[PDB]
Amino acid sequence: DVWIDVQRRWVYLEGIFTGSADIKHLLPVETQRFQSISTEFLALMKKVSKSPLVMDVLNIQGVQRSLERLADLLGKIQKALGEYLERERSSFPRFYFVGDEDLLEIIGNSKNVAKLQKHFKKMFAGVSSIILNEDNSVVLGISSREGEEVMFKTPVSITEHPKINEWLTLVEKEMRVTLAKLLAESVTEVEIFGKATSIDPNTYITWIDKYQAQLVVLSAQIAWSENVETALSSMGGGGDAAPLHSVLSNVEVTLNVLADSVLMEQPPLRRRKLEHLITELVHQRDVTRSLIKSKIDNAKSFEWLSQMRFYFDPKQTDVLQQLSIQMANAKFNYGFEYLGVQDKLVQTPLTDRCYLTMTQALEARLGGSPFGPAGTGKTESVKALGHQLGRFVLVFNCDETFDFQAMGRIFVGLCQVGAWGCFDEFNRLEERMLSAVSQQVQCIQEALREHSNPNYDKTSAPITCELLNKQVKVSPDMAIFITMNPGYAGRSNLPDNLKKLFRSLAMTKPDRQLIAQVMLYSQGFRTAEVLANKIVPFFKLCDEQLSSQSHYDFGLRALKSVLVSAGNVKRERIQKIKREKEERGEAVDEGEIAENLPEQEILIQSVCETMVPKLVAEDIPLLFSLLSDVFPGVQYHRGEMTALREELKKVCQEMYLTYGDGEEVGGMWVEKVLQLYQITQINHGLMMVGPSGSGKSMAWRVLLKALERLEGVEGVAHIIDPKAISKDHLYGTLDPNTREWTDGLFTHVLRKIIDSVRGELQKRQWIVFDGDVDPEWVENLNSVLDDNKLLTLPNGERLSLPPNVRIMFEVQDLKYATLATVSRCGMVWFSEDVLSTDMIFNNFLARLRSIPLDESPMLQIQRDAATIMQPYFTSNGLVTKALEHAFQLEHIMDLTRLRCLGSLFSMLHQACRNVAQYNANHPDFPMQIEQLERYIQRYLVYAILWSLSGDSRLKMRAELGEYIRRITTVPLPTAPNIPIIDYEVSISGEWSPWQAKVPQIEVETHKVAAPDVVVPTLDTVRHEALLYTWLAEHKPLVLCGPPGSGKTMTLFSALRALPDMEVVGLNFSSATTPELLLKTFDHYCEYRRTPNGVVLAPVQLGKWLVLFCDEINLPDMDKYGTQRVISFIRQMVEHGGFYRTSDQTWVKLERIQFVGACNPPTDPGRKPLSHRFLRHVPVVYVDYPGPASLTQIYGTFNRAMLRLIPSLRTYAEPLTAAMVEFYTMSQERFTQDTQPHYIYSPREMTRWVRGIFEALRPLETLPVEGLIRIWAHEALRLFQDRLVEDEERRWTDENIDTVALKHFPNIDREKAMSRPILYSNWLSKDYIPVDQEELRDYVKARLKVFYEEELDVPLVLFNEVLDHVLRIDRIFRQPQGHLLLIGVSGAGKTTLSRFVAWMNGLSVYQIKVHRKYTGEDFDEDLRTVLRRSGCKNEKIAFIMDESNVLDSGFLERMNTLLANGEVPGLFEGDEYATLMTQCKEGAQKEGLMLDSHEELYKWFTSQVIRNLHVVFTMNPSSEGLKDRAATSPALFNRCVLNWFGDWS
Amino acid sequence: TSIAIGSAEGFNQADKAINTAVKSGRWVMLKNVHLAPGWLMQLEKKLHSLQPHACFRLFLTMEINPKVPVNLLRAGRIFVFEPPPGVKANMLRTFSSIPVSRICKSPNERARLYFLLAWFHAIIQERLRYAPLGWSKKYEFGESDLRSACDTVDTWLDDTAKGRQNISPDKIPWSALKTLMAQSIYGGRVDNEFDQRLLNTFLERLFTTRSFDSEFKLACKVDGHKDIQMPDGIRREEFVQWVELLPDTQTPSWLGLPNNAERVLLTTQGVDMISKMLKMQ
Amino acid sequence: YQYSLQFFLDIYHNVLYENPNLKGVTDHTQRLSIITKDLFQVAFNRVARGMLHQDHITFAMLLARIKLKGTVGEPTYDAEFQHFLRGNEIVLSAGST
Ligand SMILES: Nc1ncnc2c1ncn2[C@@H]1O[C@H](COP(=O)(O)OP(=O)(O)OP(=O)(O)O)[C@@H](O)[C@H]1O
Ligand SMILES: Nc1ncnc2c1ncn2[C@@H]1O[C@H](COP(=O)(O)OP(=O)(O)O)[C@@H](O)[C@H]1O
Ligand SMILES: Nc1ncnc2c1ncn2[C@@H]1O[C@H](COP(=O)(O)OP(=O)(O)O)[C@@H](O)[C@H]1O
Ligand SMILES: Nc1ncnc2c1ncn2[C@@H]1O[C@H](COP(=O)(O)OP(=O)(O)O)[C@@H](O)[C@H]1O
Ligand SMILES: [Mg+2]
């Protein structure tokens, strides 16, 4: 794989560095480098030649490293040849359209012409390859893609013109000259064919075969124009007999001969020539009839002048100037560019109007800008006009990356070549780019105008224009055409100065009836007019009457595909009838076969092969009713593809899938697979549309496997998630400085297929876009899905889609895809009814009975379990009825069938593993079939309950349990009121309550309200068991519920039971991108190159990495409803990996899983997760603990807390009751509706308990009144600090007093609850209450010292200052204690923060923000802070202001730092190494001997958490607070919010 | 020096051109400056601290959008360009824009053709004010269409009249001009069958051999029984004088529309004027 | 419609000086009257050039009001203009019609 690339690179690199002589002067240094590298390469080749044995070469020492070094050096040299490439492109203008790599190959292989045969299709319109003799020294002629070839009159000899440019120019000129001579001869012959009463078919077919398809139509047009001109000149006398009727008769008889010729069998090239001739002659007949009807007698009449007329002058010396094409007052010269065999378009009146408008624009030397809806043939009309004049038309699919420089380079290429530029979707450019490009367009048009002046002479100085600050010669044949859909609002608007440079034209209503009629007539369809007049209104009825769906398209493209399919079907039917007459009898007559040929059923067959697959279930009977009405008495029967059906059967059996025929189970899915096969046959662009879990992926996978086994052609599929990466990573990017093109993902895949280094053109290649479709990335594929079959890049490179490549999209909806891309792709609609639940049950049971769970006793256990649950997994079974009922309930997230089904299957796999574990623990007594049956039935009921109602409240869990109890026959607990959800299934096979797993424990005094400590509760024991079950199979899972519900606590307690599992915390925000996941992977995992491919696995061997995404539904949804990180995670879950954008290499995840947490999607700032993502992740709803659970949890904490003071042990119950009651009333009173930060959770109660414990810890004794005072102080500091309005604070004070008196009646009020509740450890060692006066005196003295030693600004000590300084001191005395001060500027927030930091010994750090501040400066400041506070063990008060935030990256990095205490991607490279060094010295100083980097980084994170304190000061804005609540969730759940506000 | 704003090279070239012109005294025009609102502030600051040549003039072409900085608007002089208020003003602008030497050429019938073109352009463009009735949508009938029509008229009159001083009105290529206007010049923008029908009606009524008679009616029954007369002149200045002497009592019946097509528009405009005057009280 | 003080000062300079109507007029009173007339004329000409045609009538109405306030031999006409501007704010009843 490495040898071939190096050899291929070296061949053309040596060719370039040897053949060219000027390369030694321009670029000598890498010439010497390449000389040394080629010396090494020749040494290696000599060594290989000594021993041609493969194994001897493989045994050469360091051969792999040598080849890798050679490849790297060759790549560096190849990238260092841009200036020489530009120099080479300058000499031969057509090199501007060829890629850099292809230009390297072309120049290097100048001596060996053989490898240039696949590059001529890029520089020429129709010349795919050139024809040479056996010597390969003279160019005999050129050939087209279809095989049609032109022999040069005077062959170009390479020997006489050894230079590549010289002989290439000679070949081009000789192609033009020989085309002119052949056209002259063909005109001479068709003149004899013309003006004749009758035409002998034999000689007409001989003439058609003799000359090219491009020339026969041209000769027919020339002859017809000359005949009409002569007839009109004869009639010029006025009131004379009309010989125009003779011209019409000649046209009609020639068309009759052509129709007779196309009725029978003809070779494909001759058939295409006859089709083009018929299409042209129908227009000629129509024009002649129009001329005759109007009674036109003058050749100068405009009704004849407005038509396109061709004049041939045999007396012209210049054969290139012999033919003149005129229309109205515009005169053109045929370019004589070999076009090959192009598909002619019916010359509809709209095309006529288009021809007139565009030629009028061309004559006035300004471009043409046709506009209108898609499918109006605007682009095709432009291409057809360009081909009619023999021009080289290049089509560019413009996008926003077509900047000024790239568009200018394209203009330079067009100017020098003399070609036409059709810039499709020219309004997709940015408005600024449109304005900039208008300048270049104006300069080019001015150059063309000065060229058109008669005063200019070709012998004078060439006409040049300033393009990209260079003098570029402008050929007179150049044209600029821009086609765009103005209707599209998103499309950028064109500036007025740019719009005035083009002549617009509305192409909105194509003449569909004419095209259908002419297309059917040219294909040999008798009664083509009836078929067209039946099929165009039929398409109108399909558009109108059928239901409105986003994937329906009944425009011209659909009819066009239907017509070409009708032609193909008629040809196949003719062949089948011929073979039937061959095997039976020996009489064959083409005329009789065509006469009794059912064309109507052929057209209906094409309609059904194209329209039917995209139909929804409710529309198929309607469309068949329309078929019956429009085409009565004729029916279509789908072909029985038994050869493919047996392969589908085999693949389904090997893939554990269900196959059915007709009305059997799985029949509809097989019908969808066959329809997909048909659409693949008839289209190169496919879309599989249908809701999540409709069987699309399995459909196309099974189809690929069946096709591989049936046709023998190996199938390769490249699944790409378009929205999991940026558009630059998907298609490629162009460097604004060096103008170097870096391939994207799809571009790299397509280029690799096209190059065919390893025979990719001999394999069936399917590029599947398994992701959401938006008009930002899919519109770049417009030219790919169009007949153009071309991918145009901003750098001027054009990649042709190979005939074996199919572009497929697997999507769940097309609500954001425009009609431009819907009309460009055949649709297969996968309804959810296609994939029945019975098929899913059969697949699960087959996988269980076949695939072992461990990697056989385990297989036997699986088979027994599958046998036991077989009765319950049938239609109208327990599982199906429960699933039907569960959909009627409401859940915390939208319910999908496969989410519940996958949850249930994972739980059943866990049950089988539990049975295996029991068997392993009891080798003497293995588990018996009766015990196994009881256990499996009970666990199936339990798993159904926990999978179908996991994401719902306890009420609906009880409802589902009651419904199951109503319907099931499994034995159930006999509890009169206790729901089934409160019971587990013991391994012995009996129901046991979850309360037996909940003990009343006494947590240790020093472990009161610790983050690790978790009071055991029914919900905790149930959710822990469920999380263990789901994590055992490494299935990704999501915890949903209110903030502080205990989701993270439940997950970490569940993970503690799994010691082979390490968790890594990720906190998503609205600005989260897959880059955060990539940084986590780089820090914790490593990439290795296994023989099967690149595998990403954690550094720790044998450990599973659990990625905990803290807020999975915050990341911003773009305008088209897609989250990039969510699509990324869905890609790495469904496909088990992602794409590395550095080299477009697929990376497979190993020992990596994901766990998500999120608030309910109804919460502000939370977006619903994609149904394609929720399919793989079970969702469990962790709700807030009820009053009983809160009473139990904090009751235990209080009892453990109050054990410090024995005299207070009797007040634990009233204290807990007061805490719970006040917390409940505070939660109800202050909701998130009032303010975004009014969020109260059990976390507040945990803090409450921790604060009371910390206050009570040093006290030896304490009366009840002091305990009440501490309780009230903590209540104030927790519930009143964040309040905004004064009425809320008054309510909090009054209700604190009310609760304290209600739950503590026999206490005095004043001593325990005097309003100035102040606590401080400043005056004394302990955290005892302090009075206002002594606190004021102490703060005054300390402020005097602060002025003397630090910042010197006098301050006023009022009551609010004392309260705020006490609050800041409280926060600064906590590990990971961050601050969020909200108030007006100048209120003292920063000054008080600095004063407290000086008081507590913290070092104040503020980032010095200036104008030139950027993200790198913030990263450096963060690195400095982290090094100071984590390595040097320095307490730092990192004071940050909202004005210091100049970018969202600032907030993202700060969010990560606040949440985890460390930024993963901050320290990388040499920074990481020096950080580890400094951490090593820091640990040695602290007395810890840490060896590896893992524990060093863990210790660094712990030190940063312990030491660093962040103070965030911001103004009290209404919408700004809400914005911060989503763009930085850690600011509101990790920071203590004190609302300073304005001074009262 | 004309520069199109939107690219970094465009910004550099604009800065270089301004620095050169403030010394040499040339003119600099920057187009679509509304696409770079951030750079306009810097340009204004650069202009304020500057003492350029006496002959230096800077032109900033832009569309009317709020992204243009207020300080730039206060620093410079604003000129609003928009459709002319009426048929008379539109014809006057058309005649002023076209050079005098272009209309006065070898065939004397060219002046009448140019006058008919000016009247046709005025009628078509003035109907855009009554968007749902005058047309079906707000088409961009502008100066480019008029220039293309002038070029077509010149080309075909030169083709038919090979330098002759006079050409018979019946010999004028009426069909060629009518078809070109209906298909490429003015009919290119039209995407409606009925708008195309209206354009064809106007073209067949105006561009005909009867337009050179003294009895020809530009409009019929503008009010009561009065109607607009085709001028009897044969020279450009006489047509311009006729245009200048228009009654200045235009009604939508000059356009072929009913007189009541402007009642709602005029009432809304009067109410809006009342609101505007009250807003600055 | 962003106009600076320098714009009005330029208008005033163009009215006081470089005024064609003051070429051969020597009487102070009629020179003052001519200057007063050209002040309004030049202000309207310069400002309305960079104004939409629908606001020309508004600006002319305001200038006419300014001139009307400046004429001694004219009534204030305050009530008439108040009813012209805020007329539709008078509360009526069904029986009033
Ligand atoms: N013929 C079949 N018989 C039984 N089960 C099947 C069959 N085909 C597919 N399945 C199963 O049904 C589910 C279909 O998943 P698949 O990915 O094919 O659907 P999809 O609609 O493409 O999904 P998504 O929209 O999420 O991409 C899988 O569990 C698959 O194994
Ligand atoms: N005159 C015509 N004769 C035959 N096919 C036509 C004609 N005009 C358009 N088509 C077909 O219509 C389809 C859409 O044409 P295209 O140029 O892509 O349209 P648009 O410019 O509106 O996007 C193509 O299949 C094209 O070949
Ligand atoms: N049974 C329990 N034992 C201990 N603490 C509990 C219990 N139930 C709830 N909590 C408290 O609930 C809070 C949950 O915090 P956390 O896990 O961060 O919540 P979330 O994941 O919802 O953000 C903590 O204060 C925790 O102590
Ligand atoms: N209580 C106070 N007594 C005296 N000056 C004060 C007081 N509070 C604020 N200031 C003044 O506020 C300024 C410092 O503002 P700062 O505290 O940095 O603002 P912010 O509150 O926005 O963080 C100084 O001029 C300081 O004297
Ligand atoms: Mg197109």
UniProtKB/Swiss-Prot annotation, chain B:
Residues 1-155 are annotated as: AAA 6. The modification Phosphoserine is found at S96. The modification N6-acetyllysine is found at K217. It is linked to Charcot-Marie-Tooth disease, axonal, type 2O: An axonal form of Charcot-Marie-Tooth disease, a disorder of the peripheral nervous system, characterized by progressive weakness and atrophy, initially of the peroneal muscles and later of the distal muscles of the arms. Charcot-Marie-Tooth disease is classified in two main groups on the basis of electrophysiologic properties and histopathology: primary peripheral demyelinating neuropathies (designated CMT1 when they are dominantly inherited) and primary peripheral axonal neuropathies (CMT2). Cortical dysplasia, complex, with other brain malformations 13: An autosomal dominant disorder characterized by global developmental delay with impaired intellectual development. Some patients show signs of peripheral neuropathy, such as abnormal gait and hyporeflexia. CDCBM13 is associated with variable neuronal migration defects resulting in cortical malformations. Belongs to the dynein heavy chain family. Cytoplasmic dynein 1 acts as a motor for the intracellular retrograde motility of vesicles and organelles along microtubules. Dynein has ATPase activity; the force-producing power stroke is thought to occur on release of ADP. Plays a role in mitotic spindle assembly and metaphase plate congression. This is Cytoplasmic dynein 1 heavy chain 1. The chain holds residues 4067 to 4347 of 4646 of the full protein.
Curated annotation (Swiss-Prot), chain C:
Disulfide bonds: none annotated. Transmembrane segments: none annotated. It comes from the Eukaryota. It is found in: Cytoplasm, Cytoskeleton. It is linked to Charcot-Marie-Tooth disease, axonal, type 2O: An axonal form of Charcot-Marie-Tooth disease, a disorder of the peripheral nervous system, characterized by progressive weakness and atrophy, initially of the peroneal muscles and later of the distal muscles of the arms. Charcot-Marie-Tooth disease is classified in two main groups on the basis of electrophysiologic properties and histopathology: primary peripheral demyelinating neuropathies (designated CMT1 when they are dominantly inherited) and primary peripheral axonal neuropathies (CMT2). Cortical dysplasia, complex, with other brain malformations 13: An autosomal dominant disorder characterized by global developmental delay with impaired intellectual development. Some patients show signs of peripheral neuropathy, such as abnormal gait and hyporeflexia. CDCBM13 is associated with variable neuronal migration defects resulting in cortical malformations. Cytoplasmic dynein 1 acts as a motor for the intracellular retrograde motility of vesicles and organelles along microtubules. Dynein has ATPase activity; the force-producing power stroke is thought to occur on release of ADP. Plays a role in mitotic spindle assembly and metaphase plate congression. Homodimer. The cytoplasmic dynein 1 complex consists of two catalytic heavy chains (HCs) and a number of non-catalytic subunits presented by intermediate chains (ICs), light intermediate chains (LICs) and light chains (LCs); the composition seems to vary in respect to the IC, LIC and LC composition. The heavy chain homodimer serves as a scaffold for the probable homodimeric assembly of the respective non-catalytic subunits. The ICs and LICs bind directly to the HC dimer and dynein LCs assemble on the IC dimer. Interacts with DYNC1LI1; DYNC1LI1 and DYNC1LI2 bind mutually exclusive to DYNC1H1. Dynein heavy chains probably consist of an N-terminal stem (which binds cargo and interacts with other dynein components), and the head or motor domain. The motor contains six tandemly-linked AAA domains in the head, which form a ring. A stalk-like structure (formed by two of the coiled coil domains) protrudes between AAA 4 and AAA 5 and terminates in a microtubule-binding site. A seventh domain may also contribute to this ring; it is not clear whether the N-terminus or the C-terminus forms this extra domain. This is Cytoplasmic dynein 1 heavy chain 1. It comes from Homo sapiens (Human). The lineage of its organism: Eukaryota, Metazoa, Chordata, Craniata, Vertebrata.
